[PDB]
């Protein structure tokens, strides 16, 4: 029941918190990449493919 | 090289409602609805109702809810505020000129659509306690309240602040009834700055055609005289001493107005000896510590109080008071120079012109002029009337204070405060 949250202000405020939320997935994935040593991804990275 | 000014435009509707506007071409607009509904219109069964009413100006109306008034106004940087004297309430609204429409609608909803809901009203009654508390921390607030309580028996005796016993007790019916009885056409004046008289008139003829409370500015205030005393320990004794003066409007009232300036009202010069203040100079001659004296002058539709207001240390209280009172007595005996009277005139006149300089000030003058006089009365003609005061009338004003049954209020350590009786 979320009709409440649809208006000009809400879209301004989402548009505000977008670059931040972008970077937070950058943080979260790259951390998971590093913590699991994801192989599949890390081959792409120069220096870090230590094989 | 500014605009050659517009004139005020002033209109009496046949229902007795009064409209005045000025188009100053100002970026802001002020609107006041000035009602004959001040505190003198409470009776002993509903004391305080006009003070709750003073606070209730953003409670829900018929088609403008509480939330909307607050947000609607705040959204435009508007203000809405309500000011009572013993005679009038004055609902005034301010904003940028493009926004008069939204503000006017809010204003009329408050003064003509108050719903007064049980639960909103109940939520508000603690605020009389806070509001009273804040106001009653100037010793003068109490004094002038007791001063009125002691002078009159009735009407002007009533306090601008709700009695403590009524806090929590004033009802929605009592509120409703107060609006019905008092906020009618014959009793109102709609004044607008930075609005046009056609619009005001439309608004008035549309929305402010209300009538069927009562007529009279009139229980008629019975002066009685007396004294109220309040033991404080505040270390400084405040005291006011007073006789019945003249009703506002009358020629005699300007005699008192000028006599006020002879004896001396506030300071003019920051940290000055008040060389021109007779009361200050007479009291100083006797008295060698911190004090203040000023001539006190209140004037109402159907009475007024004149005298003076002292602040002294507890032990000097009497010395100050007796010094002050003599100094009046000395003018009654006829010791009054024409350049003294002239000085007080320039003091009064300039003070008047000064007082109407700003929008807030001008609007207030015009509002109250409308309700007390049914007119507007330009500076040129106010100063004229001021000039019209005879040296003799001022003597006689002072004669009247001296010879007239008195009223006193004082609070502090009263051990050396006199008793009327003892003056």
């Amino acid at each position: 029941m979320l009709t409440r949250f649809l208006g000009p202000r809400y879209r301004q405020l989402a548009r505000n918190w977008v670059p931040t939320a972008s970077l937070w997935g950058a943080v979260g994935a790259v951390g998971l990449v590093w913590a699991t040593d994801w192989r599949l991804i890390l081959d792409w990275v120069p220096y870090i493919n230590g094989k | 090289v500014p605009p050659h000014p517009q004139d005020l435009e002033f209109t009496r509707l046949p229902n007795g409602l009064v409209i005045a506007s000025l188009e100053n071409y100002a970026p802001a607009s002020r609107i006041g609805l000035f009602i004959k509904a001040g505190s003198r219109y409470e009776n002993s069964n509903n004391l305080g109702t006009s003070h709750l009413l003073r606070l209730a100006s953003s409670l829900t109306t018929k088609g403008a809810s509480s939330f909307k008034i607050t947000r609607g106004i705040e959204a435009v940087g508007g203000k809405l505020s309500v000011t009572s004297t013993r005679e009038n309430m004055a609902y005034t609204v301010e904003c940028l000129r493009d926004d008069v429409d939204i503000l006017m609608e809010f204003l009329l909803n408050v003064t003509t659509a108050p719903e007064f809901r049980r639960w909103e009203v109940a939520a508000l009654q603690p605020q009389l306690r806070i509001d009273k508390a804040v106001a009653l921390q100037n010793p003068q607030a109490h004094v002038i309240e007791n001063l009125h309580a002691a002078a009159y028996r009735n009407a002007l005796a009533n306090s601008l602040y709700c009695p403590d016993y009524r806090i929590g007790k004033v009802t929605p019916v009592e509120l409703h009834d107060y609006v019905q009885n008092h906020f009618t056409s014959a009793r109102m004046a709609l004044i607008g700055l930075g609005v046009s008289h056609p619009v005001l008139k439309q608004v008035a003829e549309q929305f402010l055609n209300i009538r069927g409370g009562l007529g009279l500015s009139g229980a008629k205030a019975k002066y009685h005289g007396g004294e109220i005393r309040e033991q404080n320990g505040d270390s400084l004794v405040h005291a006011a001493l007073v006789a019945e003066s003249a009703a506002i409007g009358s020629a005699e009232a300007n005699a008192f107005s000028v006599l006020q300036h002879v004896l001396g009202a506030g300071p003019h010069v920051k940290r000055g000896s008040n060389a021109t203040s007779s009361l200050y100079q007479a009291v100083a001659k006797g008295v060698h510590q911190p004090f203040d004296v000023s001539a006190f002058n209140a004037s109402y539709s159907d009475s007024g109080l004149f005298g003076f207001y002292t602040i002294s240390q507890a032990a000097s209280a009497g010395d100050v008071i007796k010094a002050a009172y003599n100094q009046v007595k000395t003018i009654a005996q006829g010791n009054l120079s024409n350049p003294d009277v002239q000085a007080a005139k320039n003091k009064l006149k300039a003070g008047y012109l000064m007082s109407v300089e700003s929008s807030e000030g001008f609007l207030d003058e015009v509002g109250s002029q409308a309700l007390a006089a049914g007119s507007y009365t330009p500076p040129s003609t106010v100063l004229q009337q001021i000039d019209a005061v005879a040296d003799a009338d001022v003597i006689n004003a002072a004669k009247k204070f001296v010879s007239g049954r008195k009223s006193m209020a004082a609070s502090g350590n009263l051990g050396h405060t006199p008793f009327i009786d003892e003056l």
Binding site: P8, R9, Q12, L13, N16, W17, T20 | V1, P2, P3, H4, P5, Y25, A26, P27, A28, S57, S58, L59, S66, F67, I69, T70, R71, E74, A75, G77, G78, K79, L80, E94, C95, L96, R97, D98, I130, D131, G194, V195, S196, H268, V269, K270, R271, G272, S273, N274, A275, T276, A343, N346, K349, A350, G351, L353, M354, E357, S358, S359, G361
Partner: protein, 446 residues
Amino acid sequence: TATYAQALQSVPETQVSQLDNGLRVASEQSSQPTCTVGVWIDAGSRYESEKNNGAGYFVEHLAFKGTKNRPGNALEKEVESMGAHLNAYSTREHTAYYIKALSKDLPKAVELLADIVQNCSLEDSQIEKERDVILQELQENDTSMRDVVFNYLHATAFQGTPLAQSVEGPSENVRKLSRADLTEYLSRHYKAPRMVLAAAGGLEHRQLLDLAQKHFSGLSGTYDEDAVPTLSPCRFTGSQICHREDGLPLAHVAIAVEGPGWAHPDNVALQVANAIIGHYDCTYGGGAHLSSPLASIAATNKLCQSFQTFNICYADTGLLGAHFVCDHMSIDDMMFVLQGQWMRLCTSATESEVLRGKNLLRNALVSHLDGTTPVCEDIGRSLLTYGRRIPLAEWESRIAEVDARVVREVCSKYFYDQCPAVAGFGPIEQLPDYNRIRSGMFWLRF
């Protein structure tokens, strides 16, 4: 009818002239029957030194107590007897003597102000009298908790600098300060380049000049050349002063980050953001429904008795924040909400509230410039601080530019992850530790 836009254009040119002096002489004609004239000196207390300090105040105290031409008592006599109002203030940067008078009295109004600002007969008798008076003021000023905390916040933020000083100075200076000290300050600082004759009301500019030349003839005429210095820049600390006194019934806190000061375009935008946070007082009508999220929560949860945002400007610096007053168990919650507000506005200012703040600011501004005295004060001060009067339309332009981005930007620049100055007074057990306050100055989510 007139639009508000139109209505701003209608407000007249502030007319400026310069004397053969340094003395600028400025005026806004209106159709008033009444005026405010006076002198804005670029003296203050940033300008004094540790030994000097509280001189200007001692001068203000002496200023109306009699000249070479009009001895002790008699200036009063003249002002009062013509129904005029004589008045003064000093700030950390500004001294102002002004008269409210009848417009027909602008001659003798100027004549007087001239006599005051040059020919101050600083009679020994009086400097002695004044020292007891000025001490009493210090004793009573100690009771205004608000007056105190702002002196403390100044004392800690500017910690090291002349700006850290009070306007009245310390007890000891007041008792030791001599006539020599005073005339030295007077002759250093009351020079024509560092003062403006300002007037507003019912007068032609031409008369104002005629009178400027007549009575301000030769102030810095042959003068000036030796040892006038410019102000030093003032280091902001950010730092805390906690003066704990549980005998007092409510706590005053005043928190601030460093402002850019008078000149800076950022003042407009900050003032908007400030306006959005606004102010509260327990006598405010209608509480829960206030626009401001601070003021709303404050009122609903009875979290204080008062708050106020501020932006005090000095040359090249200033104090930007808020001050409040509350119960001993509110100091934390009040701190939380104020800080979280600042941060919301730094990160996620929506479009709508900024239009509110913009309007609130416009309304403040027009409403502020109401009648001779405000407008005169704004003429005088402005010429000191901007070198112009900035016309109302220009402010509207400067306001209109600002929107949500201009807020989040200009807020983040001043507020985000910045060391505040805190001053605190009274029952302040629960005033958040400085680290924890400074932690409040950024969000981890952002």
